[PDB]
């Protein structure tokens with residue numbers, strides 16, 4: 133009956149019951165070496181890993197983010213030889229589960245976005261979404277040439293992979309800051325959430341175009357923008373009108389509609405052959421339907437919030453589950469760190485410059501500069517795409533260049549992701565109060 | 566903006582959207598001939614079938630139950646030549662889905678049982694669950710010998726299969742009657758729900774033993790009663806104490822615990838080798854948990870009721886999905902019809918006699934006598950077990966005897982399942998008012 137004892141006892145039963153129930157219905161998928169056993173065990177390990185980082189090993193002054201534990205828990209499973217064969221996850225299950233978690237964070241960001249602030253920040257959004265991304269790519273190519281044997285063709289390809297803000301790490305931080313409030317709320321959380329959502333299409337277009345040259349598509353990148361806007365706009369108007377207050381259980385009807393269409397848009401676009409259209413399609417759909425509701429949007433986000441907590445450990449467990457290749461390969465990776473360090477440093481400076489027009493006087497520029505660091509999702513999506521092509525085509529010289537790209541690609545998530553989440557967490561309540 | 570137009574538009578969108586979403590994640594399972602296409606189409610056909618029987622062809626006086634539509638919808642799929650390979654379903658996903666729906670109705674029946682009435686009905690419950698089951702089986706064996714070539718060995722086997730009350734047909738009707746109330750509520754709804762729950766152990770024990778004799782097990786049938794009581798008690802006292810009001814989201818925590826352990830007991834018991842223990846294990850577990858949840862028992866009920874509505878069309882659609890063998894086989898089934906007709910009539914008389922002790926004065930006897938007719942679930946599970954051994958044990962003489970079991974076993978589901986459900990509908994509010 134004790135509160136502390138009841139909480140620990142209940143959770144232990146509710147986790148053993150989940151494994152036991154699945155093992156009964158499915159004959160062998162829940163035994164060691166099975167497909168459902170790898171997913172369940174990784175889900176449990178990521179859950180416990182986050183709890184340790186913040187409740188037992190919490191630093192006095194800085195609150196250690198739980199995102200570090202989730203990546204660490206997945207890293208140990210993939211790299212430990214004795215816990216790498218009894219637990220395995222199929223690539224097609226990893227990719228399917230990876231994209232579903234991405235759509236959940238996108239709809240929640242757009243759904244809670246305030247449209248009034250977005251109207252006055254039209255000019256700032258395009259500058260923020262174009263400045264740091266393009267500038268860093270050019271610097272990365274120059275930095276790589278003087279410190280690596282990669283030519284200009286492979287120098288530019290690295291830059292686009294490196295420079296892309298991941299919404300999965302900034303969006304959860306912005307929403308928590310906005311809920312607390314600080315008496316100003318100029319629109320910084322809204323600006324950061326919107327700008328980082330559609331930055332992916334710029335990066336993927338350059339990577340594919342550069343990859344093809346080293347092996348046209350310039351117009352194709354523009355088409356992905358048009359399709360996502362048109363599909364998101366037309367479908368967004370059939371959610372605020374057809375579902376009305378007349379029907380019952382409307383809370384569970386407006387929640388399945390937005391999430392179901394978001395999943396359809398993401399997976400359908402990739403199948404056709406123009407990925408990235410669903411990246412912003414689910415942003416416009418939720419944003420348009422978001423303005424249609426002005427009384428029941430409060431209870432819809434609560435349903436989505438519980439869903440995000442389920443996919444939070446699962447998403448980052450999969451992200452840090454393919455770093456076994458570079459687990460321990462000391463080959464003077466100081467140059468790789470040097471390229472990453474300079475590129476990050478240059479990105480900070482340009483971000484401050486791009487917001488020097490008006491409004492943001494002193495602290496807004498500082499907070500925005502340090503909030504553009506995290507790089508989690510897009511880096512792992514196309515991190516090893518180039519290396520596989522080099523291996524496939526039958527050559528070898530290009531494979532070595534691709535391996536170098538992998539080292540810097542995985543290094544960004546390990547380094548810049550946990551630091552960015554930690555910095556944004558404690559500096560938000562200290563600059564724009 | 567119109568509710569009439571909104572429901573049809575909204576419901577149509579919510580069914581096409583579900584198919585499109587599942588089709589995107591799974592490449593070919595959503596296409597015709599796939600595994601997930603059979604489950605989706607069968608659920609949709611059974612859904613409209615229930616709506617037609619009550620909104621289009623509703624009789625004036627007798628309300629035609631949706632069960633007739635659900636049984637017919639699955640019947641057409643399995644028998645129509647052109648829609649019998651376009652939609653299919655694996656046996657292992659039919660059996661898994663069949664048992665899960667059975668556990669839902671058991672916990673919802675046990676949860677709504679009233680303890681006060683059960684205390685005074687010790688004598689009536691045991692007599693009701695023993696009288697008709699044994700008496701009807703004996704009459705079926707005698708009638709079969711004088712009207713068929715089945716010897717005494719096969720006569721009793723047919724009787725035990727034929728004599729069994731299905732809880733999935735009465736409990737939904739009993740719960741609705743109890744909720745409405747009629748100013749007396751002597752305990753008839755509680756008597757019928759409890760007595761019919763544990764009637765499975767006798768029917769399976771007789772059928773298995775009789776089949777073995779024609780091919781000791783009395784002791785094992787006894788253990789299934791003991792095992793269910795022992796595990797029902799220990800697992801029933803760890804649910805009304807640990808999950809308490811201190812925990813958050815307690816509504817969704819107690820509903821996962823009762824339903825999760827009910828599924829575990831049913832599937833785990835079958836695997837070990839003593840089925841039927843989980844049938845009454847989840848009945849006692851849910852009843853004991855109800856006694857501790859004095860206040861929040863009704864709040865959890867709203868979630869279980871919605872769960873059954875999902876499995877209502879799926880359960881009966883699968884029930885009428887294996888009648889292709891006897892789709893159209895005119896072989897003078899009048900003897901089979903005559904044997905079933907006599908057995909049903911004899912069952913009515915004996916049930917009236919068994920409850921002529923006290924309490925039920927005049928009208929209660931008539932209502933209870935006709936409320937023991939519905940027979941749908943247990944028949945289909947063990948109906949074709951005899952014929953499976955006949956075509957697999959190498960003997961062809963016994964194949965004819967097994968075929969006669971299928972004719973009567975499948976004929977009872979078509980006839981008595983809908984009539985019994987319809988009979989209680991228009992007779993309940995006319996006898997215990």
Ligand SMILES: CC(C)CCC[C@@H](C)[C@H]1CC[C@H]2[C@@H]3CC=C4C[C@@H](OC(=O)CCC(=O)O)CC[C@]4(C)[C@H]3CC[C@]12C
Pocket residue numbers: 145148149152833
């Ligand atoms: C703790 C509360 C929530 C009740 C749930 C208990 C379950 C966790 C128990 C009940 C039956 C047990 C199972 C019954 C027997 C076995 C022996 C063994 O099963 C096997 O046959 C595979 C290995 C072998 O060949 O022995 C492995 C564990 C297992 C499945 C047990 C695992 C744990 C189970 C599911």
Ligand SMILES: CC(C)CCC[C@@H](C)[C@H]1CC[C@H]2[C@@H]3CC=C4C[C@@H](OC(=O)CCC(=O)O)CC[C@]4(C)[C@H]3CC[C@]12C
Pocket residue numbers: 164173176177180215218
């Ligand atoms: C907080 C922890 C419990 C989260 C889950 C960690 C898992 C990764 C651990 C927990 C229990 C461990 C398992 C305990 C027993 C075994 C059986 C073992 O196989 C043998 O024992 C073979 C020895 C023989 O020849 O008899 C293989 C590893 C495995 C699945 C272990 C692998 C790693 C597991 C799943």
Ligand SMILES: CC(C)CCC[C@@H](C)[C@H]1CC[C@H]2[C@@H]3CC=C4C[C@@H](OC(=O)CCC(=O)O)CC[C@]4(C)[C@H]3CC[C@]12C
Pocket residue numbers: 144147148151164176180
């Ligand atoms: C605080 C919470 C998050 C801890 C969760 C603990 C789980 C990781 C434990 C609880 C029950 C354990 C399981 C209990 C029974 C078994 C059966 C066992 O089967 C064998 O011994 C394999 C024999 C063979 O080699 O064939 C393998 C480990 C396993 C799945 C255990 C794995 C680890 C489990 C899931």
Ligand SMILES: CC(C)CCC[C@@H](C)[C@H]1CC[C@H]2[C@@H]3CC=C4C[C@@H](OC(=O)CCC(=O)O)CC[C@]4(C)[C@H]3CC[C@]12C
Pocket residue numbers: 284285288334337338341342345350353354
């Ligand atoms: C935002 C998207 C939708 C439209 C813009 C796509 C850009 C990413 C493409 C368009 C023109 C491309 C550039 C044009 C040609 C080259 C040559 C390429 O390889 C060379 O340096 C050798 C050139 C030579 O001398 O032949 C280096 C990158 C670069 C600048 C390309 C980099 C990627 C660019 C900027």
Ligand SMILES: CC(C)CCC[C@@H](C)[C@H]1CC[C@H]2[C@@H]3CC=C4C[C@@H](OC(=O)CCC(=O)O)CC[C@]4(C)[C@H]3CC[C@]12C
Pocket residue numbers: 400578581582585588
């Ligand atoms: C209606 C509202 C909820 C928007 C959802 C529309 C979907 C129902 C559409 C969008 C993309 C369409 C699919 C894209 C193309 C095709 C052609 C075709 O796919 C194939 O290539 C296999 C058969 C063949 O060889 O042509 C069959 C239908 C399908 C999958 C379409 C089926 C219907 C889909 C899923």
Ligand SMILES: CC(C)CCC[C@@H](C)[C@H]1CC[C@H]2[C@@H]3CC=C4C[C@@H](OC(=O)CCC(=O)O)CC[C@]4(C)[C@H]3CC[C@]12C
Pocket residue numbers: 597606609610648651652
């Ligand atoms: C209220 C109704 C719509 C519920 C669902 C009924 C389904 C059983 C129907 C609806 C659409 C029908 C399908 C429409 C088209 C086809 C394609 C057909 O294949 C061909 O046309 C091949 C012709 C050729 O050889 O070129 C096979 C049947 C199928 C899947 C039909 C089978 C039965 C379906 C699935």
Ligand SMILES: CC(C)CCC[C@@H](C)[C@H]1CC[C@H]2[C@@H]3CC=C4C[C@@H](OC(=O)CCC(=O)O)CC[C@]4(C)[C@H]3CC[C@]12C
Pocket residue numbers: 577580581584595596597609613
């Ligand atoms: C009132 C509600 C319950 C009616 C529900 C209607 C559904 C039965 C319809 C809506 C969308 C239809 C599907 C839309 C697209 C396709 C792809 C289509 O693919 C082909 O043409 C097969 C070509 C080939 O033979 O390879 C087959 C029919 C199908 C599955 C249709 C089947 C019937 C569906 C599910």
Ligand SMILES: CC(C)CCC[C@@H](C)[C@H]1CC[C@H]2[C@@H]3CC=C4C[C@@H](OC(=O)CCC(=O)O)CC[C@]4(C)[C@H]3CC[C@]12C
Pocket residue numbers: 717718721766767770771774775778783786787
């Ligand atoms: C509640 C459950 C767990 C216990 C009840 C078990 C009964 C269903 C068993 C116990 C003794 C069995 C009977 C004992 C022997 C026979 C002979 C059997 O076959 C014969 O008639 C030939 C006998 C011979 O060789 O002379 C037919 C049924 C019957 C009455 C059996 C039918 C089923 C009975 C009643």
